[PDB]
Amino acid sequence: MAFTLADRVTEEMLADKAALVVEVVEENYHDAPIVGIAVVNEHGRFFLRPETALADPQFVAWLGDETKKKSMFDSKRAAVALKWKGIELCGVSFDLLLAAYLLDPAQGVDDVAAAAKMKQYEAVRPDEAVYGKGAKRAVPDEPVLAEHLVRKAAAIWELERPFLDELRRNEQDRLLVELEQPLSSILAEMEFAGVKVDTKRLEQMGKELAEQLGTVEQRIYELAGQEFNINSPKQLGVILFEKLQLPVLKKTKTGYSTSADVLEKLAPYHEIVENILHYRQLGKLQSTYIEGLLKVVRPATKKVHTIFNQALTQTGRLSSTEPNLQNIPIRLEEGRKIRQAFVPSESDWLIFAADYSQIELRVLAHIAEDDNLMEAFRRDLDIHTKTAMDIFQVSEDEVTPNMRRQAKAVNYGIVYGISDYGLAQNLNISRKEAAEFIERYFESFPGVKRYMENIVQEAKQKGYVTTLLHRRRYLPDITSRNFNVRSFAERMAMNTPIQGSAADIIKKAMIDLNARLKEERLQAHLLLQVHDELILEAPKEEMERLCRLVPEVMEQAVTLRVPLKVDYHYGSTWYDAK
DNA sequence: CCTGACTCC
DNA sequence: TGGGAGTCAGG
Ligand SMILES: Nc1ccn([C@@H]2O[C@H](COP(=O)(O)OP(=O)(O)OP(=O)(O)O)[C@@H](O)[C@H]2O)c(=O)n1
Ligand SMILES: OC[C@H]1O[C@@](CO)(O[C@H]2O[C@H](CO)[C@@H](O)[C@H](O)[C@H]2O)[C@@H](O)[C@@H]1O
């Protein structure tokens, strides 16, 4: 494969259609080096050194010109890496990573070679082959690097049409071009903006937490009558089941279980298990949300810059890494206070948080076309209280807080394919009763039962299931004669259209929201998405408008057979936006 | 490196 | 024997 190793940018490299590689080898691309550039177009194939291309006003103009279309793989990586250099990338019309992800998330495509494999294209090497793995990872000699980048660009160039053609067959071309690609740009902005952190506050919490860990730790040793590593499920298992001779409720492949659910069930036998649960909760707060967070905060700006992986989950959700900002504590007050350290990036700005209320159950209502479930949402009746009246068979006045919590476990459990065994274990109730709850639920919501039957049948017949905006998940195990394997696939068939349609909806909402913010020239911008919620920051003056704009855009992103409902709060910190 | 903790939706 | 994720310490 012939290419030019160019010393300067020329006009023919700046055609209005090109495959473009802007190579960043560090896995975390924030403020990461760009090691090489390749361009393939109608005129030839070119390798450029970054020092050259990125200092060249004409190349930089071309990068930022939206009418000059680029085909890429992982354009968000390149866009953010370029942002850290103050260079804008526009005109990305095809992203091979996102295309491959839509065609089959299970393939785990994460380099051009793996995408190319999908079309039996082999004139390109895997990145790991060129760079090496782990401690061996290195950028090779220029001629080797240059050929690799050029070959990746040529693969993207040749693969665009084949991938677009299959997406069109799957009814997924608009999902790529109107949803995932625009979202990629929005996520790039979110990651690059980052979220500001009050490190003084975290360091203080950390100091206090260290004190408390020491106290809980020593009390646990007193209760155990021995010192041991409480963070070692192995050592803990000996203490609990050999020394204290507590009952063994569950084993894993390696030994005794010490899961939270097991320890809770052991509470009637020894008080030490409650202390241990507390200690493990505190230790995670310290290790992860204090120490781990502080490790990744950029010290001069005090911002953290997560990476949203847009091409990983099997259902169409995002994930968040380094750090994960989608699992910041909220359920326990001690941990929830971590959110006090997430603050606005400017003076006199505020945090604004908006979340869909029960979007999975509303989606289930839509997809199952269950009259009773649809009517509950159409009239905004409390769905957990409704299910309680049904499973316990009482009037609304007789529903206690605990009954509602159990009904809630039923409501979400059904969505995730729970068995009577799993429900009984989660609620710690008789399995006979758990089975009755499930039987009563399906008697009350017969449309949901038909849905579960139908979607498993569809998966068996077609080999995959689909979401509202035509995302797909293949389920080859659905016809397995093996009960365990088939059962897991049946649960995925039931759940994926629900979880995945919910992901589709919030993604479309982010695009519609961005458009409106820019339309109204507001300074407000997105910081985070947490599956069914959106977190923004804005100058305090803009709260009144956002209180109207954000929930309307979210509720109207798609139109279902039941309303969507969005709650919203704002405050001086993420904690206070409650 | 894998497992089993913890955290979120 | 409930769906989808990431990080951490221990081994
Ligand atoms: N028994 C439960 C309860 C909750 N969840 C999970 O935790 C998420 C958040 O649940 P939650 O906030 O409690 O849902 P709500 O319906 O909004 O609860 P509530 O009306 O009481 O505020 C759910 O989407 C689900 O993924 C679960 O798996 N099992
Ligand atoms: O840039 C995100 C993009 O890159 C991939 C590899 O193609 O994931 C890499 O980067 C992630 C973000 O740092 C890492 O978490 C991951 O380990 C690394 O392979 C894709 O998975 C992805 O969407």
Provide the positions of strand B that have an atom within 7 A of a protein CB: 1, 3-9
User: Tell me, in Å, how far CA of A418 is from C1' of C4?
Assistant: 15
Q: How far apart are CA A508 and CA A145, in angstroms?
A: 38
Query: Ligand 2 in contact with A25 (CB < 6 A)?
Result: no
Question: Cβ(A483)–Cβ(A477) under 8 Å?
Answer: no
Q: Is the CB–ligand 2 distance for residue A74 below 6 Å?
A: yes
A565 lines ligand 1 (CB under 6 A): no
- Which of the ligands is closest to the CA of residue A361? 1
DSSP state of A578: -
Q: How far is the C-alpha of A155 from the C-alpha of A136, rounded, in Å? A: 26
Distance CA(A19)–CA(A112), nearest Å, equals: 12
C1' of nucleotide B8: residue with nearest CA: A327
Whether CB of A360 is under 7 Å from strand B: the answer is: no
Q: Which two three-digit tokens encode residue A414?
A: 């059904």
Give exposure, A327-341, as e/b (b: 16+ Cβ within 10 Å): ebbeeeeebebbbbb
* Structure-token pair, residue A12: 């023919």
| Nearest nucleotide from residue A231 CA, by C1' atom | C9
CA distances from A231 to A211, A255, A276, A578 (A): 17, 15, 9, 33
Q: Answer whether any strand B atom is within 7 A of the Cβ of A182.
A: no
Secondary element (H or E) of residue A193? helix A181-193
Please tell me whether any atom of strand B lies within 7 Å of the Cβ of A265: no
The ligand 2 atom at the shortest distance from the C-alpha of residue A111 is 7
The token pair at A355 is 């979340």
Cβ neighbours around A568 below 10 Å, total = 19
**What are the structural domains, with CATH classification, of chain A?**
1-192 (3.30.420.10), 193-307 (1.20.1060.10), 308-358+503-577 (3.30.70.370), 359-502 (1.10.150.20)
Experimental technique, in short, is X-ray
Q: Is A32 in the pocket of ligand 2 (CB under 6 A)?
A: no
Residue A468 and residue A365: Cα distance in Å, rounded? 13
In 3D space, the residue among A318, A437, A450, A433 whose CA is nearest the CA of residue A387 turns out to be: A437
What is residue A569's three-state secondary structure?
strand
Q: Tell the residue nearest (CA) to atom 26 of ligand 1.
A: A412
Q: Which atom of ligand 1 is nearest to the CA of A408?
A: 1
- Are the C-beta atoms of residues A188 and A299 closer than 8 Å to each other? no
* CA proximity to A281, closest of A231, A237, A227: A231
Give the closest nucleotide to A307 (alpha carbon vs C1'): C6
Which residues, in sequence order, are bridge partners of residue A71? A19, A94
Evaluate: CB of A92 within 6 angstroms of ligand 2: no
Helices (H), ranges, A84-180:
96-103, 112-117, 127-131, 142-169, 173-174
- Ligand 2 center to A2 CA (angstroms): 30
Q: Which ligand gives the minimal distance to the CA of A363?
A: 1
Q: Is A566 in the pocket of ligand 1 (CB under 6 A)?
A: no
Assigned token pair, A538: 């804005």
Evaluate whether A510 touches A526 at the Cβ level (below 8 Å).
yes
> Is A374 in contact with A446 (CB distance < 8 Å)?
no
Q: How far is the CA of A236 from the C1' of B5 (A)?
A: 12
Distance A391 CA to ligand 1 centre (A): 18
Nucleotide in closest CA–C1' contact with A237: B4
- Closest C-alpha among A315, A362, A339 to residue A558: A362
DSSP, residue by residue, A48-116: E-HHHHTT-HHHHHHHH-TTSEEEESSHHHHHHHHHTTT-----EEEEHHHHHHHH-GGG---SHHHHH
CA of A146 to C1' of C3 (A): 44
Secondary structure, 3-state, A157-180: HHHHHHHHHHHHHCCCHHHHHHHH
User: Which CA distances in Å does A469 have to A58, A92, A169, A372, A551?
Assistant: 39, 22, 14, 25, 21
Measured distance CA(A438)–CA(A435) in Å, rounded: 5
Contacts of A166 by beta carbon, 8 Å cutoff, 6+ apart: A103
Whether A125 is in the pocket of ligand 2, judged by its Cβ within 6 Å, is no
The ligand placed nearest to the CA atom of residue A319 is: 2
Other beta carbons within 10 Å of A38: 26
Q: State whether the beta carbon of A284 lies below 7 angstroms from any atom of strand B.
A: yes
The resolution of the experimental structure, rounded to one decimal in Å, is 1.6
A260 touches strand B (CB under 7 A): yes
CA A402 to chain centre: 31
A298 CA, B3 C1': Å apart: 32
DSSP-derived 3-state class of residue A285: helix
> What six digits make up the tokens of A568?
């919203």
Distance from the Cα of residue A463 to its chain's centroid: 25
Q: Which residues pair with A36 in a beta bridge?
A: A23
Q: What is the whole-number distance in angstroms between the Cα of residue A315 and the centre of ligand 2?
A: 17
Atom of ligand 1 nearest to the CA of A360: 24
Residue A465's DSSP bridge partners are A473
Tell me the pairing of strands A464-466 and A472-474: antiparallel
A321 lines ligand 2 (CB under 6 A): yes
CA Rg value for chain A: 27
CA A404 to chain centre: 29
Q: Is the backbone of residue A134 left (phi > 0), alpha (psi -120 to 50) or beta? A: left
CA distance A289 to A338: 7
Asked if A552 and A561 touch (Cβ cutoff 8 Å), the reply is no
**Residue A205 CA, nucleotide B6 C1', distance (Å):** 18
Q: Is A189 exposed, middle or buried (0-12, 13-18, 19+ CB in 10 A)?
A: middle
Is the Cβ atom of A408 under 6 angstroms away from ligand 1? yes
- DSSP lists the bridge partners of residue A6 as A48
Rounded Cα distance, A491 and A56, in Å: 54
Q: Under a CB-based contact definition with an 8 Å cutoff, are residues A118 and A103 in contact?
A: yes
How distant is C1' of C11 from CA of A23, in Å?
37
Q: State the DSSP code for A20.
A: E
Helix (H, G, I), strand (E, B) or coil at A88: coil
- Say how many Å lie between the CA of residue A355 and the centre of ligand 1: 12
